[PDB]
Design a protein around this ligand. Structure first.
Ligand SMILES: CCCCCCCCCCC(CCCCCCCCCC)(CO[C@H]1O[C@@H](CO)[C@H](O[C@@H]2O[C@@H](CO)[C@H](O)[C@@H](O)[C@@H]2O)[C@@H](O)[C@@H]1O)CO[C@H]1O[C@@H](CO)[C@H](O[C@@H]2O[C@@H](CO)[C@H](O)[C@@H](O)[C@@H]2O)[C@@H](O)[C@H]1O
Lengths: 367, 75, 48, 48, 86, 738, 601
């Protein structure tokens, strides 16, 4: 099972917040540009066909057990030129309003709490060459899951992070049986200071710094039927905490945890590439990969299939994903479903994601 | 009609008029922390349960078969 | 928690390092107990 | 905000019976597991 | 370029409650329960389009403590709700 | 790939987004100053989308997304790809799909989410499905309408801390008064009862029967006189009874029976002084010496009076039934009044005839004196439990709560008593080397006697008239043996599994029910004295006596139609079986799907008493394991009247963890089978029908033959296996030590 | 300063067994033995000084997702500490749990065990303390006994000891329940007074000189006392026992992962045959035959829910429209329904002993009469017969004037049901029900009026007969005396509505319930040879009689031209009921011998 998992703060940032990418095995770093291209690769907002767009996404949790426990995302982008784009997003995980009814009197005034976690980020993407673009994103993260009691401090914990991303999209290149198009991208995410959940520097958690690299290829048939195959690789940029021992019995473990927790996040990024007694073969074990296929009909209907595979030693979150998309006039509707193939229960099992995006403004020609 | 109250690590269920048949208390992970198939009361107190993990989901099966869901904070 | 997070006037870091006043974290008492991120990580000790 | 009352179980009445069981624990520097109801001892070496 | 009527609906409520137990033979008027809660719900509507509607809301409730077992509570909920019809 | 190029999937509904802030400030001074206020961002989505349309006249979309729906199944999404008839692929479905099967041994599934494909090779139809099952199969049994609910209660599982005799007089009169039930050998008529309990709610309200709070002192021995067959130490706790009683031996319970009479407090020779009326001086209020604060009496300072909806009482047999049981240190005290013909007896002190709550002397607060006086009541439950005191025996142990039963009726209730050692046997056998008492009375027969007769629950026929050996059925007496409104069964003796069976097994006068060392080795095996002389937890230590089983059933109908215990049942998932044959959904019965009501339409089955089994899919489930449903069905067609099938199904549950605890197991079952269907038309049968005297019909005669064989290959999933073997944990010991 | 990182009251699901286990001592509350039951945690006892707590080899902590984070669950073992004066030679201390466990579908019962010495106490030696499982329906009369001498983990040096040395495979209980079955079958031949039995009555096959092979397990000592049943375990007990003769021993013993293994996953089969035919809208026949074997079941059914019995069932339902055999010029509706079916169920396990398969017990009996009794008492047989004449009426020809004396205003219904059963609990069961109903209704079509607006009347004869003969499970020689329940009733109710005036309206209704007691002797003894058709058209004594009268009046005061503004409306409803009292009241006999009629209500 899971051995020596990587411990990071605010793990809700790694959850796929849109149905389109979730239907593609939780990957978007090298897919076609879309309104949700902020969590995955802000650099391809400069390749958007529409001038601006606004999207709303809903990812419910524990659907059979309760309602209003969900991860919500609102994204807005607006590419002012054919080379630059401005984008902002708001991911929000909350349990909904919870009534703190202490006594049993029906009419007693009750305090309502809404434990929640949200991230507000804005990105600027600039198209350097006709096929390459880069982006920089600044994110504010706030964690407010704790509820105030006589002993518990419920002060929200906050942190800031920056993202550096790049997107490559080649021109339509003709082949023997079709005319394809190549895509690639990278996204270094959540680069920022440690988040102190208990407002103490001695107890700080690494931000979920993450590196996504990926490539995509589009099969174009009859200029109206498109099949897109994308592969994504993901690696956390957080050092792995020690397990058995690597210097009494508990003294060695305590010293190892002391050394692991006394690492800066900038230094932790480089310690991620290593910090293990194994070689390259055993450090490739920490690499998460995801494969996806997407068939497009008239650019208004999409069928999405994807496979996501984490290492069984780290998280062990592996599943198959199915997705569908419909565009009426300017409304695109995306739904996705997850089939888990892992020993550990996936909290998003038996859950249908919903995404709704509005496209308006001018149209930009694709190169 | 249905009220759930937590005073000191104790959960009190108050379902006026209607009789509760079963109560299942879940931590917010899908994990069942407490289940009682034999409540049969209009008021029930979960005194043999204590977790301290803040947010809990109380699902109550009524005698009619209706299922009432309430989210609580385990003070 | 005000003594540990927003230190009041007249309280120093030395006052918070005694084994009678320092904040006790759950990992010290329960190194093998996993706690969800964003949840309670400190042990609220009853002090006599 | 509650008034101080000589009624702790909040049944409006003040009990005056002293029928109870007694248990005691020694507090001394050299306590070890196996005596004085001690079942486990955890040593912390270098605390931040 | 966009013309719309603004609908304002303001709902204020002030509720007072007191439970007193009175002794007949001596001055022992005991305050057993009470509530002093006032609330204000203000909403403003604006139709940016036939499909798109924006509503501003502001809910402010303050409950005073009548007896010490209750704590004074302030609840303020304000923001914008955007509704799009299909 | 699609018929045309049109795409007309038009969204319907609305989307709402809440963007705002939430501010909260509760002024609890115990809270940290860091917790003085909460300022959180508020976000909310209220999607109520609907999606309908087509893509190229071949793909159909039917989706509905609502964030405020039920658990998971109201968010439907159906993709249906229907190509032309000449293609091998006939129909592909993705999303909410169903796998209906025309089979009795192998049932299909209606609530599935996955991929369903249908193939046609000339005349052979192949239907394959891979999906996740969102529903759970539920089966109910109905006879004469209402659903049948079965119960099993062991002797130890009585309704504890709820039912109390009002006095030792009623307790000791109970057995003899019910000897010739339904006739009650007692003229006791309880006219008035006031019940007081420890007040922990502490709420003043004018609608809950007013604000009647009083200081209370509850005396264990109040109103008690001697009992002929019972020693005085088993009736009263007073250390010395010398000069205590002042009425004849078998006098009915009344205030004037002893020197604790509230009416004679401190007159000339009472055992109580005026100090008894004050909480502070309660101890000094006793004239007798050895008095303890929780044995002889108990005090409450703001005791709350129960309203009439919080309890019921039996006016004739002198006991009470609380709505809420007192399983904790609560004090129970009562005042009651009853008539025996023209005579009126009172045992407690009512608010109407008791001392005033408050007496004030003086003119102002500087010199005023406040005297708060207590009502003297009869203690039915003490603050501190002591099973050696008679107040413990006031608690009835002979009342059994039928689970889930609220409106039980005669002809809708069955009860039998079994001895399970280990199999259920409805008679008692003597211990080897011994015999039951010779030549017993007909009412004390034990040898070869059904246990209902042994425990005095079957002496009447259907019309409640006495019958020599009974009618084999539980005597349903609304006033004696059952509590119809609450669905409780009450034995006609106070200790049916104790003193009653001891008496029926007694062989000589040298054996005493209160002396276990004198038992005759049949009483050693069968008499469960500890369930009456000890608490239930304490009686758990006597592990070999909890072998008598109360077993039966009752019918819960309520309204017309069979209640199947599920709402919004998926269409086509209901199967009804009468006597091994499957009924027809249009002829024999009708289904109200939204309310979960099954109505039997066949007139012969309604007036039959035959047990009707109803199976259905329940999609109102939560906290269940992920259920994978997959399989294929073959539908070969030799001729227009002969069809063969080849169904094969597999279902696997995904455990939450690798440790499957007992009861919460996971299955990996595989089922497969074959079916045949031959349906011909026989003109000969119609021709023979026309040969009958007055038949002139022309409708055809049809013969239908259906055969099916099924094989089940069950297993457990590899996930919940320990060292390569299917494993169920009786106790992994993780759930102990809360 | 004392700082409590934790401070709890801890309640355990396992209860210390108080009272005696060995008959040689008979003094539990003495001898100063400190018996402690607790739990040892990976989360709290990873640094325990005698031995660090570690998971048994192969055991892993459960893993769950709390909020996008992996949470390792706690792993716990039940710890038993024996201290103070120490255990005597044959003394034992145990904890128990009340459960409901069926382990017939599994082949192995397993548990991990650990033993260690107490610090500052004499060292516990190997095979001196014996861990034991005792389970059954109790701990004194009906239980299996599984014992294992315990090897002691060597302490003294480092507190961190390898899991293979904390949880020795030599100390693990690995029990095959087939060995328990063999032990029980062998103990069937050991009487309770045998010298082969222990002082506690436990039969130990390993201690039997005349038996070769012992209990079939060289690692475990197996015992049995009184026919327990692992098909329904109501009592689970683990504990420690001593074998050190001249020594008082102290130590700590851990129990972990008590589990069932090796699921018996052999399946089953079922077959269904359906024959449906119709005879030109006159007769329809539906026949069904069902055969299922042991191990069959539904897809969703678990190990303990699948079929544990062979089932053979047939059912034939026949419907005839006998009214069509008559000329259609007068319309007779005469539907005839005939249903017959029987079901035979043979259980996998013999109902006696509940945990030995029926065929195995039959084979290992060596007594022909006992073989026949065992074979016959296990059969669950049900036979059902249903004859129905519901809805008999004469239809109206398409043009006649309705008349009050018409036979078209009548409806007749007759239902007969019979159930014959015999199974492990009843040697002979017969349930007979007969229902005859006649309905009449006529609506009249158009000083004060006296012609009724409508007339209603119906009569019901209901006769339920029940015979119950509980079987003797030991021998099929005589059996219990049969019990008879009879519910012969005669019901009739009538009602007529009136339109006495244009405003005044009168409705009357009366119902009567009669009971027929022809089946009772002079005393309160039912007659043995009483047929359900004996005196069918017999009206019995009245049991319940009720009357209802409804009056509606509009108060025609508007006729006079001075009170025409009044709109009065008067309604009067009256109810009466007479209820026969029980014979216990109407013939009550006081102890002095006088018989009193306490009357009705
Ligand atoms: C940070 C994001 C803030 C939120 C942005 C909202 C933008 C609202 C503009 C409405 C809109 C976008 C669709 C949005 C709907 C999604 C709502 C989802 C709610 C989820 C709960 C609908 O327009 C479409 O929808 C139809 C609705 O029926 C319209 O019909 C008609 O609609 C009405 C005539 O407009 C009729 O009155 C109605 O009779 C008809 O029916 C059609 O005209 C059209 O198809 C059209 O956008 C256009 O309007 C202008 C006006 O200023 C906007 O100017 C921009 O403002 C800044 C950008 O805000 C930019 O910086 C700035 O450069 C630029 O000047 C542009 O946007 C422009 O392109």
């Amino acid at each position: 099972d899971i051995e020596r998992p990587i411990t990071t703060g605010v793990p809700f940032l790694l959850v796929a917040a849109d149905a389109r990418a979730a239907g593609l095995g939780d990957q978007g770093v090298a897919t076609s540009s879309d309104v949700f291209s902020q969590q995955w690769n802000p650099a391809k907002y400069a390749f958007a066909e529409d001038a601006q767009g606004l999207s709303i996404s809903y990812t419910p949790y524990l659907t059979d057990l309760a309602n209003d426990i969900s991860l919500g995302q609102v994204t807005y982008y607006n590419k002012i030129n054919d080379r630059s784009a401005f984008a902002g997003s708001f991911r929000y995980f909350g349990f909904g309003g919870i009534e703190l009814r202490q006594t049993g009197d029906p009419n007693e005034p009750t305090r309502e709490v809404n434990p929640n976690e949200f991230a507000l980020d804005g990105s600027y993407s600039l198209k350097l060459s006709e096929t390459f673009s880069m982006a920089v994103a600044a994110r504010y993260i706030r964690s407010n899951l704790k509820v105030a009691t006589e002993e518990i401090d419920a002060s929200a914990a906050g942190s800031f992070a920056v993202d550096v991303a790049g997107f490559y999209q080649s021109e339509e290149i003709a082949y023997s049986d079709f005319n394809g198009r190549w895509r690639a991208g990278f996204n270094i995410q959540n680069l920022g200071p440690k988040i102190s959940y208990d407002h103490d520097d001695l107890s700080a958690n690494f931000l979920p710094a993450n590196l996504r690299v990926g490539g995509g290829f589009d099969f174009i048939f009859d200029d109206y039927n498109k099949l897109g195959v994308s592969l994504e690789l993901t690696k956390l940029l957080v050092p792995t905490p020690p397990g058995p021992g690597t210097p009494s019995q508990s003294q060695a473990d305590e010293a190892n945890y002391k050394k692991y927790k006394d690492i800066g996040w900038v230094s932790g990024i480089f310690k991620s590439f290593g910090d293990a007694p194994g070689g390259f073969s055993e450090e490739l074990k920490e690499i998460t990969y995801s494969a996806a296929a997407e068939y497009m009909y008239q650019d208004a209907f999409a069928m999405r299939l994807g496979y996501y595979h984490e290492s069984p030693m780290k998280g062990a979150k592996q599943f198959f994903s199915l997705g569908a998309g419909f565009k009426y006039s300017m409304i695109k509707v995306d739904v996705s479903y997850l089939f888990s193939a892992s020993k550990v229960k996936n909290p998003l099992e038996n859950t249908l994601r919903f995404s709704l995006t509005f496209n308006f403004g001018d149209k930009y020609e694709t190169y | 009609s249905f009220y759930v109250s937590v005073k000191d690590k104790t959960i009190k269920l108050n379902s006026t008029e209607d009789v509760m048949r079963e109560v299942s208390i879940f931590d917010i992970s899908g994990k069942l922390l407490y289940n009682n198939k034999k409540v049969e009361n209009t008021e029930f107190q979960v005194s043999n349960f204590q977790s301290g993990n803040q947010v809990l989901i109380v699902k109550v099966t009524l005698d009619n078969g209706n299922i009432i869901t309430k989210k609580i904070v385990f003070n | 928690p005000v003594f540990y997070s927003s230190k009041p006037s007249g309280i120093s870091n030395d006052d918070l390092s005694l084994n009678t006043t320092r904040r006790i974290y759950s990992r010290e008492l329960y190194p093998n107990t996993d706690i969800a991120q964003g949840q309670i990580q400190v042990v609220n000790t009853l002090d006599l | 905000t509650l008034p101080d009352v000589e009624d702790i179980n909040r049944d409006n009445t003040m009990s005056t019976i002293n029928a109870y069981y007694e248990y005691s624990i020694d507090v001394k520097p050299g306590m070890q597991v196996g005596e004085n109801y001690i079942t486990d001892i955890r040593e912390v070496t270098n605390v931040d | 370029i966009i013309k719309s009527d603004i609908n304002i609906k303001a709902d204020f409520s002030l509720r007072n409650n007191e439970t007193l137990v009175r002794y007949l033979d001596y001055d022992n008027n005991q305050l057993a329960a009470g509530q002093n809660i006032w609330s204000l719900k203000l909403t403003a509507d604006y139709s940016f389009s036939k499909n798109l509607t924006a509503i501003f809301y502001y809910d402010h409730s303050f409950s005073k403590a009548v007896i010490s077992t209750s704590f004074p509570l302030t609840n303020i909920r304000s923001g914008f709700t955007l509704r799009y019809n299909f | 790939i699609f018929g045309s190029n049109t795409i007309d999937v038009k969204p319907t509904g609305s989307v709402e987004m809440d963007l705002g802030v939430r501010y909260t400030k509760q002024d609890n001074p115990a809270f940290s100053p860091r917790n003085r206020s909460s300022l959180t961002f508020d976000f909310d989505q209220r999607i109520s989308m609907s999606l309908m349309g087509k893509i190229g006249t071949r793909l159909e979309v039917n989706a509905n997304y609502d964030t405020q729906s039920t658990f998971a199944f109201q968010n439907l999404f159906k993709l249906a790809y229907t190509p032309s008839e000449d293609d091998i692929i006939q129909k592909v479905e993705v999303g909410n799909v169903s796998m209906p099967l025309n089979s009795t041994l192998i049932r299909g599934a209606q609530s599935l989410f996955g991929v369903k494909t249908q193939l046609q090779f000339g005349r052979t139809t192949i239907t394959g499905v891979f999906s996740e099952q969102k529903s759970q199969t539920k089966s109910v049994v109905a006879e004469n309408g209402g659903t049948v609910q079965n119960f099993d209660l062991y002797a130890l599982d009585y309704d504890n801390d709820r039912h109390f005799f009002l006095s030792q007089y009623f307790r000791n009169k109970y057995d003899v008064s019910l000897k010739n039930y339904p006739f009650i050998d007692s003229r006791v008529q309880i006219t008035r009862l006031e019940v007081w309990v420890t007040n922990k709610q502490n709420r003043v309200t004018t609608t809950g029967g007013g604000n009647n709070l009083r200081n209370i002192i509850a005396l264990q021995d109040l109103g008690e006189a001697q009992v002929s067959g019972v020693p005085d130490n088993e009736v009263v706790v007073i250390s010395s009874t010398a000069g205590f009683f002042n009425n004849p031996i078998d006098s009915p319970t009344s205030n004037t029976n002893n020197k604790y009479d509230p009416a004679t407090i401190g007159q000339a020779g009472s055992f109580l002084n005026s100090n008894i009326r004050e909480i502070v001086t309660a101890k000094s209020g006793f004239n007798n010496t050895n008095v303890s604060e929780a044995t002889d009496y108990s005090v409450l300072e703001n005791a709350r009076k129960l309203t009439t909806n919080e309890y019921t009482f039996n006016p004739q047999l002198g006991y009470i039934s609380l709505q809420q049981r007192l399983a904790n240190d609560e004090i129970l005290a009562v005042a009651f009044e009853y008539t025996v013909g023209g005579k009126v007896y009172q045992v407690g002190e009512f608010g109407s005839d008791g001392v005033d709550a408050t007496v004030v002397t003086g003119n102002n607060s500087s010199n005023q004196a406040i005297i708060t006086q207590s009502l003297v009541l009869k203690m039915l439950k003490s603050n501190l439990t002591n099973v050696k005191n008679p107040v413990w025996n006031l608690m009835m142990k002979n009342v059994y709560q039928i689970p889930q039963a609220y409106q039980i009726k005669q002809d809708d209730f069955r009860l039998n008593i079994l001895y399970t050692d280990p199999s259920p046997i409805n008679y008692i056998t003597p211990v080897q080397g011994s015999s039951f008492p010779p030549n017993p009375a007909p009412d004390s027969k034990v040898e070869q006697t059904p246990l209902l007769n042994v425990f005095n629950l079957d002496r009447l026929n259907y019309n409640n008239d006495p019958q020599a050996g009974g009618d084999g059925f539980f005597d349903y007496i609304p006033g004696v043996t059952v509590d119809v409104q609450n669905g409780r069964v009450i034995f006609t003796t106070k200790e049916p599994f104790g003193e009653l069976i001891f008496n029926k097994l007694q062989t000589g006068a040298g054996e005493s029910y209160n002396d276990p060392t004198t038992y005759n080795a049949n009483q050693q095996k069968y008499v469960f004295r500890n369930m009456y002389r000890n608490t239930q937890a304490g009686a758990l230590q006597d592990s070999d006596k909890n072998k008598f089983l109360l077993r039966g059933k009752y019918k819960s109908s309520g309204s017309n139609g069979i209640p199947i215990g599920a709402f919004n049942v998926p269409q086509g998932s209901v199967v009804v079986t009468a006597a091994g044959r499957v009924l027809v959904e249009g002829i024999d019965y009708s289904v109200d799907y939204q309310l979960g009501r099954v109505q039997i339409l066949d007139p012969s089955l309604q007036a039959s008493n035959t047990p009707i089994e109803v199976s259905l899919e329940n999609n109102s489930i939560f906290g269940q394991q992920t259920r994978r449903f997959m399989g294929f069905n073959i539908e070969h067609k030799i001729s227009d009247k002969f069809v063969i099938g080849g169904t094969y199904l597999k279902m696997t549950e995904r455990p939450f963890t690798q440790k499957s605890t007992y009861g919460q197991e996971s299955v990996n079952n595989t089922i497969f089978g074959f079916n045949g269907n031959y349906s011909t038309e026989v003109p000969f049968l119609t021709r023979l029908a026309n040969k009958l005297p007055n038949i002139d019909t022309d409708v055809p005669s049809n013969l239908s033959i259906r055969g099916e064989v099924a094989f089940l290959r069950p297993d457990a999933p590899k996930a919940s296996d320990f060292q390569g073997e299917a494993t169920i944990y009786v106790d992994d010991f993780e759930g102990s030590q809360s | 300063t004392v700082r409590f990182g934790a401070l709890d009251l801890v309640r355990g699901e396992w209860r210390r067994y108080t009272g005696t286990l060995d008959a040689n001592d008979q003094n539990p509350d003495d001898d100063g033995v400190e018996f402690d039951v607790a739990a040892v945690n990976i989360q709290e006892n990873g640094t325990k000084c005698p031995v660090n707590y570690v998971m048994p080899p192969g055991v892993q902590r459960e893993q769950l997702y709390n909020n996008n984070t992996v949470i390792n669950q706690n792993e716990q073992a039940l710890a038993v500490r024996i201290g103070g004066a120490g255990l005597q030679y044959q003394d034992s201390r145990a904890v128990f749990k009340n459960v409901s466990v069926d382990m017939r579908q599994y082949k192995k019962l397993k548990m991990f065990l650990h033993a260690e010495s107490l610090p500052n106490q004499p060292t516990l030696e190997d095979d001196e303390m014996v861990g034991f499982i005792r389970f059954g329906n109790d701990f004194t009369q009906n239980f299996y006994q599984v014992e294992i001498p315990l090897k002691v983990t060597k302490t003294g040096g480092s507190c961190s000891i390898s899991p293979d040395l904390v949880w020795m495979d030599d100390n693990s209980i690995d029990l095959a329940l087939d060995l328990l079955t063999r032990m029980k079958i062998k103990a069937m031949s050991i009487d309770i007074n045998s010298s082969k039995r222990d002082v506690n009555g436990i039969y130990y096959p390993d201690n039997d000189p005349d038996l070769e092979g012992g209990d079939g397990d060289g690692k475990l000592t197996l015992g049995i006392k009184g026919n327990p049943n692992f098909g329904l375990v109501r009592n689970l007990m683990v504990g420690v026992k001593s074998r050190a003769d001249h020594k008082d021993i102290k130590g700590e013993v851990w129990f972990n992962e008590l589990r069932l293994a090796d699921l018996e996953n052999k399946g089953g089969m079922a077959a269904i045959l359906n024959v449906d035919t119709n005879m030109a809208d006159f007769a329809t026949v539906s026949a069904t035959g069902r055969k299922s074997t042991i191990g069959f079941g539904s897809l969703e059914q678990g190990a303990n829910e699948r079929d544990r019995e062979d089932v053979q069932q047939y059912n034939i339902v026949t419907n005839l429209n006998l009214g069509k055999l008559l000329p259609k010029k007068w319309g007779i509706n005469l539907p005839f329904n005939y249903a017959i079916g029987e079901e035979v169920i043979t259980p996998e396990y013999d109902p006696f002993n509940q945990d030995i398969k029926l065929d195995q017990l039959i084979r290992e009996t060596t007594d022909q009469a006992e073989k026949d009794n065992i074979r016959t008492r296990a059969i669950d047989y049900t036979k059902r017969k249903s004859i129905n004449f519901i809805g008999v009426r004469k239809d109206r020809a398409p043009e006649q004037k309705p008349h009050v004396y018409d036979i078209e205003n009548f409806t007749f219904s007759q239902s007969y049901n019979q159930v014959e059963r015999h199974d492990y609990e009843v040697a002979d069961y017969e349930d007979e029900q007969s229902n005859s109903a006649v309905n009449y209704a006529y609506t009249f079509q158009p000083n004060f009026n006296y012609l009724p607006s409508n007339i209603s009347f119906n009569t019901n004869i209901l006769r339920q007969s029940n015979r119950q003969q509980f079987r003797e499970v030991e021998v099929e020689g005589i059996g219990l005396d049969p019990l008879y329940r009879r519910n012969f009733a005669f019901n009739y109710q009538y009602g007529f509505g009136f339109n006495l005036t244009k405003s005044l309206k009168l409705n009357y209704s009366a119902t009567s319930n009669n009971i027929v007691r022809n089946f009772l002797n002079d005393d309160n003894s039912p007659k043995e040879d009483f047929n359900i058709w004996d005196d069918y058209l017999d009206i019995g004594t009245p049991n319940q009689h009720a009357q209802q009268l409804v009056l509606n009046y509009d108060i025609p005061i508007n006729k006079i031209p001075i009170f025409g503004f009044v709109k009065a409306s008067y309604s009067y409803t009256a109810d009466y009921m007479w209820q026969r009292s029980s014979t216990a009241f109407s013939e009550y006999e006081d102890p002095n011998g006088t018989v009193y009629d306490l009357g009705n209500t």
